[PDB]
Design a protein around this nucleic acid. Structure first.
Lengths: 133, 64, 345, 91, 345, 61, 128
RNA sequence: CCUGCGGGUGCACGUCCCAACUGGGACGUGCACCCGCAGGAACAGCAACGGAGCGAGUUGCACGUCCCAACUGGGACGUGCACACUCGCUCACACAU
């Protein structure tokens, strides 16, 4: 099975800040947990872009393995402007598995809920502590 | 889409339909990112590319 | 260094129409320089765009004409054309001329193209050797019908080389060098017929259009957008100069004839190049050949048809060296200085 | 309906419901040109003229009952002389 | 970077250098060392008619070419000439030297208008390489070498050399140069008689016929057939241009007199090559010498015999400079512009 | 046949009855292929020769 | 040796049988000579047979010069769908065919006496 | 007067005999070798009165809002986007010191 250290090296030169291994598990757990509510997770490039345009707060997750970068390289700076924390995940297939749809998604928008308030808090703080280059 | 590529030492586009390249690194898709003229994200792209060193003016100038 | 003299750099490294200007035949070094015109790469930005062109890696869906009009709308230019129409679902190089450089559109039609296609064979062939041979036999001048006029045309396929074949998916990729006008959809249909299985083109990508290719200053449409945004909102011309290249780069392959600053304006008014005004001419000039008249600064005055060979110019003292085909430089760029020859009678 | 018929060329291979017939006469047939047998029997029409400009092939689309298998190696196919072009026209 | 220097540097041709020397040693065929020719007058009006020798259309190229063919072992040379006539579909075809049926090597086959030069090549030098066997053994190799040294003269045999000798089989191979018409079988039997044991030939291979040799684009008959087939199917003449060579290549050893474009058709229609139309000439012309009349495009107008030394042509203003020997140019390749002169009128 | 040859640095032809040149390689027979006018194998010759870059068009100069 | 011989062959000698495949190919030639009409040797007979439409596996010897004598036969084989391969030297073909004289090329039909080796060589050739 | 043009041996092929990239035979095809005519009567002219520049004739795409069931493909509602000759006007009519 592909290791996590080698899997990170395959991501683009724009895939930073890159959630470490423990944080990556925490991000997968969060996405799985939030799936329960249909209308509290966004999925897809157009969908996440639309909601970030309409000022929807939360934590966005990207896929480090994306090519060409010019389909999503404008979203990193839209999140920075609008103060939405974000972190890149080692590879797209992992996020796809996190949702359990087998079709990897480039990005996701996890909002806050009572059911997963602690986890969403734990992850948001960790991402902020990670730092932006 | 099917056509992907990997670069050799001369930086020549070597076309393969394989997801993984000979040396081990992945393959870069062969098609440019879809363009819509009503794109209001030029500033953000400039900022990110400047951050990571990908803008055109940052690569060495050509030799015409 | 920034202040190094021009001569300190070997002549094999000069800008785009002066490359190896000493390797040419020197009819006379003597001329009065004039203070007009600019070097191609040092033009002001308001004229660089008007006398430039782009190498746009086309997106997937839009038509070529839509892409050209898009660049026109972004750059706020008056005219724009392209020198080879790429299908709506087909990616790859596309040379877009801006304003004054649209006069070179026609000259670029007959350039040699190159594509890299993907073809799916209905049934299963035995061995990649069969497909390599099938591509081998489909070479030279070939009958081709435009895909769904119906006038059969003959265009040559100078070369072809299979890059990848993947048997489980029965799809593969092949690189075809072709004369302008070649339809690679038809080539794929014929190839499928030839292997005896059937097949069709499911994805195409141009990889060179004349002397321009994917490694030769190619740029995506996001880059044009961002260059214009930088110019409007920041006053930064670096991006626009990286993206747009001078029209003199489409003519590096034309045999050259340098003319004196006195003759540059006569040619713009319809005058035929005459031998007295020639400073330098390049070997290999044949009768009825397309050559580029170049100012001493490297600007492109016109495309002219040579009516005297290299040996004739080397042995004559007057006459018509070349007739005109398409004048590029605008009139009155250089002053009117015709009628003041050594006789002036 | 065919006042006359001449030998277009001999048989090649089969590609699904198509029959590629190695064309011999230097002339290039018309698109959707009815190809007949020796006894003036139309079997189909032309669909895809492919190959070089002197040694080439011409596919046919059998519609009126005849099948690709019905023919066999060496067999010969004909065409109306009036449904040809000179090789120089396209060249 | 160098690109930055290109974008920021002037890079304009210097106003003057005061020297305009030409480097003509590399121009093709009869234009080599063009500038070194004595220049009598550069005042003339070139005509747009006619091509350069190497860049003719394919029809005129085949009609005025020659093939250095590697002759197969079996046939007679006239058979090879008939074969080339059939393949290339040319009205007339000939050759200079008739190689024996069982010989191989250089064989200059002239195609339909270079056939006027065959007479001139009949005297050209020739080289061979023969294998011979002796009836009885000799003392030592030095005896053979001496025997060859005694057959170097008017028997002519300009040189000879024992390339190899096997004493076990008494078969050795030697390289000889000889004037045209020499029968090398006679030479080998003579060497056998001189050696005191007798001898006869087994093999022979002509290794040069005049200025044409083995490495000077010699091509097998297979190359001729393949070239014709490629041109007749792919409509490609790159093969047929490598195979055939312009007939000017056989006249590169002659002294040249270039003439105005207005005297070309006069010389074709027979007129003598008068001084009023001589633009340049090669120093070293002696009375009764074979020279080639050349247009300024490198075309071999004709073969004439000089009636004026270089000095006289330099120091004279009227009179006939040569009489014609063979009009190699076809009539009406240039317009008839004789009779419009000042003196003539 | 008897005559054969081998190439020195210049491409100058060095004839010799030897089957092995002093450089250890075989010796190329001086004589070309026997020719038949009624030869129909020209397409196949171009096809094969091109595959290995031996065609005249493919050499420099 | 074998590698030096392969170096001594010509540039058009591809595909090339390895040493082991060469041993198997030569065993085939030896086992095929036994029957008169089921092995064709020499250029003229093999070429006439291929033109007629005979089937089998063709073998070439790559030490032949000028290649113009056999530079067209590989392409005739490809067109007619006949497996083929080259072998390092001619003197092996001659020695393996029961003739001290070297043989440039051959064509081995199918006989039940050597069916197994025939199919094995065909399979090995198809995988090169 | 000058010029141009004309006036049974071997070999290749296909098919058969036998005893190398072959020599041997036979049969058949093929290919190679054993003065008249015509053009012109020529002293080699021609450093701008036809060139250029403009104008006319000879369905998909992208945005947004919605329905649903990857950088997606689908639907509807609105947006914007692309789908050689002749005839006119102007310029000079240029041998470039």
């Amino acid at each position: 099975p592909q290791s996590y250290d080698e899997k990170v090296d395959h991501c683009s030169v724009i895939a930073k800040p890159m959630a470490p291994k423990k944080l990556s598990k925490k991000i997968y757990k969060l996405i799985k947990k939030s799936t329960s509510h249909k209308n509290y997770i966004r999925n897809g490039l157009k969908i996440v872009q639309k909601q970030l345009r309409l000022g929807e707060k939360g934590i966005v997750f990207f896929a480090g393995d994306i090519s060409p970068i010019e389909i999503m390289c404008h979203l990193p700076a839209v999140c920075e402007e609008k103060d939405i924390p974000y972190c890149y995940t080692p590879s797209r297939k992992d996020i796809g598995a996190a949702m359990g749809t087998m079709r990897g998604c480039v990005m996701v928008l996890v909002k806050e809920h009572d059911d997963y308030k602690d986890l969403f808090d734990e992850v948001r703080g960790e991402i902020k502590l990670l730092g932006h280059p | 889409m099917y056509l992907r590529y990997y670069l050799n030492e001369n930086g020549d586009r070597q076309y393969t339909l394989a997801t993984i390249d000979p040396y081990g690194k992945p393959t870069i898709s062969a098609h440019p990112a879809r363009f819509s003229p009503e794109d209001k994200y030029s500033r953000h792209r400039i900022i990110i590319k400047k951050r990571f060193g990908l803008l055109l003016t940052q690569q060495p100038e050509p030799i015409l | 260094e920034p202040t190094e003299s021009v001569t300190k750099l070997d002549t094999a490294y000069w800008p785009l129409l002066l490359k190896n200007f000493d390797r040419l035949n020197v009819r006379t070094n003597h001329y009065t320089p004039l203070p007009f015109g600019h070097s191609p790469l040092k033009r002001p930005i308001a004229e660089y765009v008007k006398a430039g062109f782009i190498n746009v890696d086309k997106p997937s869906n839009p038509s070529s004409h839509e892409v050209v009009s898009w660049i026109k709308r972004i750059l706020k230019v008056e005219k724009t054309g392209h020198s080879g129409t790429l299908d709506p679902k087909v990616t790859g190089c596309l040379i877009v001329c801006i304003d004054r450089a649209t006069r070179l559109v026609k000259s670029q039609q007959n350039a040699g193209k190159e594509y890299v296609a993907v073809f799916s064979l209905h049934s299963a062939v035995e061995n990649v050797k069969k497909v390599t041979q099938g591509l081998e036999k489909l070479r030279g001048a070939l009958f081709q019908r435009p895909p769904l006029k119906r006038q059969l045309r003959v265009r040559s396929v100078y070369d072809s080389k299979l890059l990848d074949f993947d048997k489980d998916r029965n799809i593969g990729v092949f690189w075809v060098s072709c004369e302008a006008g070649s339809y690679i959809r038809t080539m794929c249909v014929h190839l499928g017929l030839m292997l005896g299985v059937g097949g069709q083109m499911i994805e195409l990508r141009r990889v060179r259009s004349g002397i321009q290719g994917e490694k030769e200053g190619m740029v995506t449409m996001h880059d044009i957008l961002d260059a214009q945004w930088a110019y409007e909102n920041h006053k930064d011309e670096s991006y626009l100069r990286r993206v747009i290249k001078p029209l003199e780069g489409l003519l590096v392959a034309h045999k050259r004839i340098f003319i004196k600053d006195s003759a540059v304006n006569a040619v713009c008014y319809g005058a035929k190049v005459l031998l007295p005004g020639i400073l330098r001419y390049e070997d290999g000039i044949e009768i009825d050949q397309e050559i580029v008249i170049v100012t001493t600064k490297g600007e492109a005055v016109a495309l002219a048809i040579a009516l005297m060979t290299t040996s004739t110019m080397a042995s004559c003292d007057h006459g018509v060296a070349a007739k005109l085909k398409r004048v590029i430089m605008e009139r009155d760029t250089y002053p009117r200085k015709w009628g003041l020859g050594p006789k002036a009678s | 309906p065919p006042e006359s018929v001449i030998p277009l060329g001999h048989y090649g291979w089969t590609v699904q419901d198509d029959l590629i017939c190695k064309v011999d006469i230097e002339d290039v047939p018309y698109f959707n040109a009815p190809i007949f047998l020796e006894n003036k029997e139309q079997i189909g029409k032309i669909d895809e003229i492919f190959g070089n400009l002197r040694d080439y092939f011409v596919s046919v689309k059998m519609g009126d009952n005849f099948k690709a298998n019905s023919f066999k190696d060496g067999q010969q196919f004909y065409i109306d002389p009036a449904k040809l072009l000179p090789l120089k026209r396209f060249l």
